[PDB]
Amino acid sequence: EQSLPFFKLFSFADKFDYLLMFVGSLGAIVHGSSMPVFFLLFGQMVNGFGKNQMDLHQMVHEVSRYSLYFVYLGLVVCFSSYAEIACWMYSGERQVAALRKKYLEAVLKQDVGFFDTDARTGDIVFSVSTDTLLVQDAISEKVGNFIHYLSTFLAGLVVGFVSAWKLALLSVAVIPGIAFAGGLYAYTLTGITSKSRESYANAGVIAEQAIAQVRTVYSYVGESKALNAYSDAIQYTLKLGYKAGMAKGLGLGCTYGIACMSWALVFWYAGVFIRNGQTDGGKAFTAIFSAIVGGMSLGQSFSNLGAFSKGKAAGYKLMEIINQRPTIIQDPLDGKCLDQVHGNIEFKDVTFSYPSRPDVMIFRNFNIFFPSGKTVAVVGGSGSGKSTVVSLIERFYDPNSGQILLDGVEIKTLQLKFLREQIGLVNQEPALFATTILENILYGKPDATMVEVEAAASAANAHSFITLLPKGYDTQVGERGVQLSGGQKQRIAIARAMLKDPKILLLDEATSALDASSESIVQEALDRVMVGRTTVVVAHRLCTIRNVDSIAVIQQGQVVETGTHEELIAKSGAYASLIRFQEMVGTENYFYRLLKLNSPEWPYSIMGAVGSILSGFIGPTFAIVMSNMIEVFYYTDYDSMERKTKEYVFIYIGAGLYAVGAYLIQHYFFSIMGENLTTRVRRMMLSAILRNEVGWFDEDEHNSSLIAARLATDAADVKSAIAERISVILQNMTSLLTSFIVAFIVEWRVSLLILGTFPLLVLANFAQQLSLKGFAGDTAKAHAKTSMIAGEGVSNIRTVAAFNAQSKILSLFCHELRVPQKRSLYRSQTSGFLFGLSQLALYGSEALILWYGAHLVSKGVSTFSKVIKVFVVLVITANSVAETVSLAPEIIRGGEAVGSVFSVLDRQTRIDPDDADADPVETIRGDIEFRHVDFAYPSRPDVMVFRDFNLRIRAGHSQALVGASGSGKSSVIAMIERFYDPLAGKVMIDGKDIRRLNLKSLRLKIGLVQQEPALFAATIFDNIAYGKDGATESEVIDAARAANAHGFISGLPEGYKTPVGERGVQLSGGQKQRIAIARAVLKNPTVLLLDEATSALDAESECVLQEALERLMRGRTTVVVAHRLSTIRGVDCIGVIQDGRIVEQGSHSELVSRPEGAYSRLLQLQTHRI
Ligand SMILES: Nc1ncnc2c1ncn2[C@@H]1O[C@H](COP(=O)(O)OP(=O)(O)O)[C@@H](O)[C@H]1O
Ligand SMILES: Nc1ncnc2c1ncn2[C@@H]1O[C@H](COP(=O)(O)OP(=O)(O)O)[C@@H](O)[C@H]1O
Ligand code: VO4
Ligand code: VO4
Ligand SMILES: [Mg+2]
Ligand SMILES: [Mg+2]
């Protein structure tokens, strides 16, 4: 797959960032290059066997001075390490923030066309969360460490050039093997990272889709299906990670083996050179040490190379989206700002085909007139051309032919910000963001004070219900207003449209939930403030548009007639056809628990720990062999030094092969155990989340995008923390223990002193680990909040485009992201200071060791040879282990991630889905009853939506539940399919409490349809076959025929295979509701918890659907709710009043014959509207 070049990642750095990166590079270079020249100086005393050992008095003074020089080097390294760590971390944090802001701005600028063809909310959330973290890790202090290692290697090579050239020619000719291995490693890791990212992106979308529509998932029991799909979506990542781990082990082993063969050859040539006499001791010592340190540094920098590979792999995907230029805008040509705006929309021979289905022609030579100040109404069939006109007007899609005129010029030539402001669009189904009511209203005009908002709310008949809420204007509505009533949602959208005060009003299929009285109030408000402005009304019910001057019906291709009410009746046209159709229808200690959780694959962990320890041995063995080599060199051994050198080069060859084997084994087995653990924890976390009740979802921090981001982020660190920390910790402790034992072997008093210094280093590391942890937790929540904001913005692009609100989203993003920069500055400064202090403490320890050894030499025993061998071994081992401190921060940032993982698993649901023993009874009766049920929603537990009321539905009957003011129409449905718990009383379905019956059987025996159906992002056939899984295509076809859906479905090109899209877009409300009814009838439950169904079906299909529903409910119990008072002819148990309490139900015919009542007044008002 394609990958962005590494240098292209630095595309968001200003002058200040360039200076910081330059300072960091200089500091890293100095830190790397300090050591080789320092040991070049150190060689003068390393030659002590022939330099000044004759006079014992001068040895102690000389080595004390050299200890002071080593302390000076410690100060120099401490100062240098501070600069390169702090400057690089600050530069990385600044760049990623600008990248995130630019990416959000670029993705929020794309039109609706880009989102429907290849874009998903889950994909966007995952790209925001994970990829930006990888890019931040790519350009962080990892580059500093890589530059430090490279500078050390080059400095060692230059030092080798100075003393004796041939040795350094070998050390420079061995480069191509390491280069080729690194190239293969980078290429393979980039490929594997691309594949794994693709695999993970699909998994994240599936989980979030199931989480968002939790009510539909619970109603049509499908947690097993979602879990199986999620597990299958991450099947390939196991093999890809296995290959990546095998590649990592092979590269490091090959590098170390090449280094070992180079060391053996360089030792043999150095020996023969000393035999020649051209070289003398110290030069060979310096060259050998330089070569060893260079090979070690390359082996260390291999991991940073891999990190860079992954970073560039993610950076390609991030950069590809932002660089995508938007669709056509082309608006400023002549009419930049016309002051003669009056409406007068002209449509001339305009054709249109949607990008998803370009073959189907929606419009063919479409002509229509929208004169100024005239309330033009649009009516037609269920899905012909109604909402497409609004989409064309609101610059969503251009027409492939023809043009449309805003009374002075084609709309293609305008100003986009100017155009969208003059027209106020009302969505067919409003999409309220997750923000308080007042700010939702302020979406329209952000510069409106309280008085204007109050006036707008009062105009739209929304003051009453808003002021009755506990908080008032600050109550949250949650995701898409799921926790707010359907009727109250429409009032908020109307108020938001009114506050904008546009010159052209586009009333789409709104004003549907308002039963009779709110309808009259909003119509009075509309034709009292919108008089004198261009008006376009798209209404299904014919009574609302009775007082319309010109009713232009829209059918296939073009319009038919543009007459008034009475004029179209005379010819009977096609408008009067709808009228006569309507008339006849009416008649702590959790890390150990996490390791315990990985019990089944214990052999892999054991063998990996064996490999880690075994590679831990080889660290100090190099120093031991080098010390013995220099000892025999200074003896000059002109008897059997040939034998000594050949035996030791054989040792080197064996050690190289040994290291290859050990590294391969260790890395492969840790890779496999880490991937198994990550997959298992992901599966269990998703199962635990799906186990929770709906109330846990109805909160502020429990959002679909938030949960998806948390799942995507946490497990990843859970891998990276477990895989990396375990390897380095075991290796470093094993190497340190081996070096300490070796120090014990040659000396005892000196080594006790060095083991007396470990508390200082461990306390410094503990301080490091403590300091960074506290502020790391705060930033995680902020990043999750930003991801949630981005996902919420992307999910409602239709509302964002209509009401220009990109500035608000950017402002919220910046406000959320402001704090982490300020915290990161101090975090970087503290980390750099602590790293410098740790390095200074580490170096100061060795100087004291050398001084103590010198003092012992002055006193007698433990002479020159023993102390300096200890010094060299400690130097090598400390240099080898001086990587855990650098690796500590990025590992320790996942500590709070693990705590979040266990917090989700720990929580026990209040609603146990099965309980595994709770009366598995399948013989359902259907005689539901309520007894003194008192309920209050957990979100606002101060409203008491239900009073002491009781209602009974005998099996074989039906409910009407007229709900004029939203009190309990949809709340009773939540009781039967229990989502919450009644505070008092009890509810029974089969004569027994449903709290003790297992939910799986009950939810299998019962089925419902939502008031606002939300189709899954799949084909029509998959959506229909969601209920009663394992259904042949014949059954699906029969269900679609019975639901009056085979008509339009067969009209579609790809039969029952056309993709729908997220939330159920790229279709019509009528078609979506038909598909939902088809799924519900396919499930075929004993009790059909029906609800408001004749919402978007007010067309020529109304008679067919109602008859089919009546036939379906012949042997079923239904609770259908309907404020339309037209499709409730089933005269059983209407249930007139549900305002908190209940009122005597009787029957529909009874209350028709009974005197004035809530149903009677509703019918009177509807007939008056008629
Ligand atoms: N975003 C879209 N992508 C592809 N096809 C669409 C899209 N929106 C609407 N359509 C198609 O256009 C037709 C009419 O849709 P719509 O305007 O919603 O009808 P109505 O508004 O009368 O219900 C539908 O059959 C649907 O298949
Ligand atoms: N999930 C929820 N969280 C908080 N309040 C809710 C929730 N669902 C409904 N309500 C409140 O209960 C009242 C009645 O809602 P609802 O049952 O939808 O009425 P209807 O079904 O008659 O439209 C509303 O005013 C709403 O504020
Ligand atoms: O907002 V409702 O149509 O459930 O009364
Ligand atoms: O816009 V609709 O004709 O699916 O109510
Ligand atoms: Mg529509
Ligand atoms: Mg409702």
Curated annotation (Swiss-Prot):
Q: Per the UniProt entry, what are the Gene Ontology biological process annotations, in alphabetical order?
A: acropetal auxin transport; anthocyanin accumulation in tissues in response to UV light; auxin export across the plasma membrane; auxin polar transport; auxin transport; auxin-activated signaling pathway; basipetal auxin transport; formation of plant organ boundary
Ranges for domain ABC transporter: 345-581, 928-1164
What membrane topology was assigned to this protein in its record?
Multi-pass membrane protein
> What happens on changing residue 39 to A?
Impaired brassinosteroid exporter activity, but normal ATPase activity and slightly reduced activity stimulation by brassinolide
Q: What is its biological role?
A: Brassinosteroid exporter that, in conjunction with ABCB1, supports the accumulation of exogenous brassinosteroids (BR) in the apoplast, thus promoting BR signaling initiation involving the specific receptor BRI1 and required for plant growth and stress responses. Mediates the transport of castasterone (CSA) and brassinolide (BL) across the plasma membrane. Auxin efflux transporter that acts as a negative regulator of light signaling to promote hypocotyl elongation by mediating leaf tip to petiole auxin flux.
Phenotype for residue 292 to A: Strongly reduced ATPase activity and reduced activity stimulation by brassinolide
Disulfide bridge positions per record:
none
Phenotype of null mutants: Reduced rosette size associated with decreased brassinosteroid signaling. Reduced sensitivity to red and blue light-mediated leaf positioning and morphology associated with reduced auxin efflux, thus leading to constitutive upright petiole angles, and irregularly wavy and small rosette leaves. Aberrantly enhanced organ bending, including increased gravitropic root bending. Reduction in bulk stem auxin transport and lower levels of shoot branching as well as small increase in branch angle when combined with the disruption of MAX2 and MAX4, genes involved in strigolactone-mediated signaling.
Residues with an annotated glycan are 676, 703, 732
Q: What is this protein called?
A: ABC transporter B family member 19
Q: What does changing residue 622 to A do? A: Impaired brassinosteroid exporter activity, reduced brassinosteroid exporter activity, but normal ATPase activity and normal activity stimulation by brassinolide
Q: Where in the cell is it found?
A: Cell membrane
- Activity: how regulated: Transport capacity is stimulated by the chaperone protein FKBP42/TWD1. ATPase activity is specifically activated by bioactive brassinosteroids in a dose-dependent manner, including brassinolide (BL), 24-epiBL and 24-epicastasterone (24-epiCS). Inhibited by vanadate.
One GO cellular component assignment for this chain's record is:
cytosol
Q: Which PANTHER family match?
A: ATP-BINDING CASSETTE TRANSPORTER (PTHR43394:SF11), ATP-DEPENDENT PERMEASE MDL1, MITOCHONDRIAL (PTHR43394)
Q: Which organism is it from?
A: Arabidopsis thaliana
Concerning what turns on (or off) its expression, the entry says: By auxin (IAA). Induced by red light, but repressed by far-red light. Induced by brassinosteroids (at protein level).
